[PDB]
Amino acid sequence: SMEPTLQSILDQRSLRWIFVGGKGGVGKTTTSCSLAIQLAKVRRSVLLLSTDPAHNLSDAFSQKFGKEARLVEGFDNLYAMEIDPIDEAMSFAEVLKQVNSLSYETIVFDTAPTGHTLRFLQFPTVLEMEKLDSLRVTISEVNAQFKDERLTTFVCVCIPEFLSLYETERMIQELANYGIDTHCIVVNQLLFPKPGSDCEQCTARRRMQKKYLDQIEELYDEEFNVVKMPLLVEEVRGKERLEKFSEMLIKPFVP
Amino acid sequence: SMEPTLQSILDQRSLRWIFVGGKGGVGKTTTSCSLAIQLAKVRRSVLLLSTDPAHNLSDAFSQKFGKEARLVEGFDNLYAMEIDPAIPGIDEAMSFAEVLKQVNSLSYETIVFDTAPTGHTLRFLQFPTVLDVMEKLDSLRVTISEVNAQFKDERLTTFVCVCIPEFLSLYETERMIQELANYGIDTHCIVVNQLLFPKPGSDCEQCTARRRMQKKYLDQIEELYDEEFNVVKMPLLVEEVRGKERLEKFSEMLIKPFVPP
Ligand SMILES: Nc1ncnc2c1ncn2[C@@H]1O[C@H](COP(=O)(O)OP(=O)(O)O)[C@@H](O)[C@H]1O
Numbered sequence: 339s340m341e342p343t344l345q346s347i348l349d350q351r352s353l354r355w356i357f358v359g360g361k362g363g364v365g366k367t368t369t370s371c372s373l374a375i376q377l378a379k380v381r382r383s384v385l386l387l388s389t390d391p392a393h394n395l396s397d398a399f400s401q402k403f404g405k406e407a408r409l410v411e412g413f414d415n416l417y418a419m420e421i422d423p424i425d426e427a428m429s430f431a432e433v434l435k436q437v438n439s440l441s442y443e444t445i446v447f448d449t450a451p452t453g454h455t456l457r458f459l460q461f462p463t464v465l466e467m468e469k470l471d472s473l474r475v476t477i478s479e480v481n482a483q484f485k486d487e488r489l490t491t492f493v494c495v496c497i498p499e500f501l502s503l504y505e506t507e508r509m510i511q512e513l514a515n516y517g518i519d520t521h522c523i524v525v526n527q528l529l530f531p532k533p534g535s536d537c538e539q540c541t542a543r544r545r546m547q548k549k550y551l552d553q554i555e556e557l558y559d560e561e562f563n564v565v566k567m568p569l570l571v572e573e574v575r576g577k578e579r580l581e582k583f584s585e586m587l588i589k590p591f592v593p
Numbered sequence: 594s595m596e597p598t599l600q601s602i603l604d605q606r607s608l609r610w611i612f613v614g615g616k617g618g619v620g621k622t623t624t625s626c627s628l629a630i631q632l633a634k635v636r637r638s639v640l641l642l643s644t645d646p647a648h649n650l651s652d653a654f655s656q657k658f659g660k661e662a663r664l665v666e667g668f669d670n671l672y673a674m675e676i677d678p679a680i681p682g683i684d685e686a687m688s689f690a691e692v693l694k695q696v697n698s699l700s701y702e703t704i705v706f707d708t709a710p711t712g713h714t715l716r717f718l719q720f721p722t723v724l725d726v727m728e729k730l731d732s733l734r735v736t737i738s739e740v741n742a743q744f745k746d747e748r749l750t751t752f753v754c755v756c757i758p759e760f761l762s763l764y765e766t767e768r769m770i771q772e773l774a775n776y777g778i779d780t781h782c783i784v785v786n787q788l789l790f791p792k793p794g795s796d797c798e799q800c801t802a803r804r805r806m807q808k809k810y811l812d813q814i815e816e817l818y819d820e821e822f823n824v825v826k827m828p829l830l831v832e833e834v835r836g837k838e839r840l841e842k843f844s845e846m847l848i849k850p851f852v853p854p
């Protein structure tokens with residue numbers, strides 16, 4: 339059993355590429371932000387980077403963002419940008435490369451669902467004139483970065499419900515197969531009924547969710563920071579609301 | 594104002610390709626099923642076809658499915674299958690195009706498609722307008738302007754839009770409906786999903802507040818689209834919607850409004 343908190347990612351300075359994965363709408367984006375916001379507080383600079391074809395960085399922050407970096411309003415520290423790149427994975431490689439050797443200390447990546455993330459990792463192994471070798475070279479480098487776990491982890495976002503956790507599983511697992519590190523799970527949108535209330539629906543639900551959770555724990559307790567975040571009444575938008583949510587990431591809502 | 598039900602899709606016999614779209618996890622797959630289930634009840638046969646680079650038909654029905662058609666357990670009528678297909682997007686759509694052509698020539702009377710994210714269906718459209726060996730660019734040519742014919746024909750093809758009350762989802766439904774407009778393709782239904790109506794008689798801050806927050810959205814959807822979209826409302830159930838059994842039930846509401854006071 340480890341802290342149910344991301345404190346550890348705060349602590350691990352080595353980190354250069356933090357990847358947030360999970361299933362469509364489990365709340366990936368929302369975290370990516372929260373996480374950045376939180377790192378942004380304790381790093382020199384943090385670049386938040388969306389690849390998802392539909393970008394919601396902007397929407398999340400209420401702020402037009404481009405393939406051009408820029409300061410996030412209400413910060414001096416944190417930057418965000420939204421771009422889009424057999425062979426789609428090649429344009430992606432290029433971005434990381436150039437970015438990687440940018441003057442940003444840590445990057446939190448947002449992207450197209452476990453799906454693309456997946457195919458891409460697989461790739462290198464796929465390939466198994468001198469520009470042939472030139473490409474090879476760089477991929478190879480990039481891949482190593484990936485396996486180096488001082489430089490790269492994944493956070494797993496998910497909510498309690500069959501189809502999401504089933505990804506988080508496979509995902510964690512391929513991450514294992516490809517020799518890439520990952521030790522956090524943001525289980526999100528938990529419903530805790532407000533104490534003192536009897537309310538069929540909330541009770542019943544906390545029941546149904548609870549069930550999943552317990553599992554998650556039992557499975558992963560010992561090796562994953564398993565973070566628990568409350569499902570808020572309102573969407574999580576605005577620097578303001580996001581800062582707040584992001585707190586919990588770091589110190590457990592425990593009501 | 595039209596009925597808040599998909600009765601119209603049951604009624605519209607000409608339909609051949611029903612596409613269910615919306616944002617990741619708003620409940621696309623679940624409807625696709627429910628919708629097929631219900632059509633299945635009043636068509637000769639229905640093919641439920643997934644492209645999501647995912648395997649969620651199976652998971653939804655608890656049943657291994659493949660690029661090979663097959664009978665859905667507990668039905669004699671309904672079939673489901675799951676596959677995955679110098680430019681980029683180009684190779685890709687080529688693929689998809691070929692699927693449909695392929696599949697349009699089976700007996701199945703009506704097909705309900707499940708698929709890869711607005712991004713992907715979107716690429717498809719932007720693409721055409723845009724767009725004994727080589728004698729072959731001719732053949733694709735042909736395949737697209739027909740396929741794309743059938744997209745533009747509103748006797749053969751609509752979209753159903755799925756979504757739930759929350760900023761980001763509805764903002765897609767909007768753009769989507771809109772591009773659908775721009776590309777001359779029909780669409781006239783909205784399954785707003787996951788509504789929370791508090792059980793009557795219950796005072797319960799959170800449920801109240803939420804019904805408040807969602808309600809706000811809904812009222813809107815209605816005002817804007819009341820007059821021209823069947824705006825269907827579906828309750829958010831305690832348990833996941835899996836199993837033929839559970840999906841049958843759910844799907845009912847698709848057709849006859851959950852209306853609890
Ligand atoms: N714990 C939560 N409570 C309330 N709203 C949330 C929560 N997590 C996410 N949301 C809202 O629900 C939507 C889903 O979050 P998002 O990060 O966009 O998911 P994804 O990017 O994984 O599809 C967003 O509109 C967000 O504001």
Ligand SMILES: Nc1ncnc2c1ncn2[C@@H]1O[C@H](COP(=O)(O)OP(=O)(O)O)[C@@H](O)[C@H]1O
Nearest residue numbers: 617618619620621622623787828829830833834
């Ligand atoms: N209205 C609802 N009530 C209860 N559970 C639902 C409802 N809609 C969807 N679900 C379940 O939520 C999860 C996601 O639904 P899904 O159809 O997979 O979304 P998508 O296909 O858009 O990614 C699945 O558990 C689904 O069965």
Ligand SMILES: [Mg+2]
Nearest residue numbers: 621622645649
């Ligand atoms: Mg789906």
Ligand SMILES: [Zn+2]
Nearest residue numbers: 537797799800
């Ligand atoms: Zn309640």
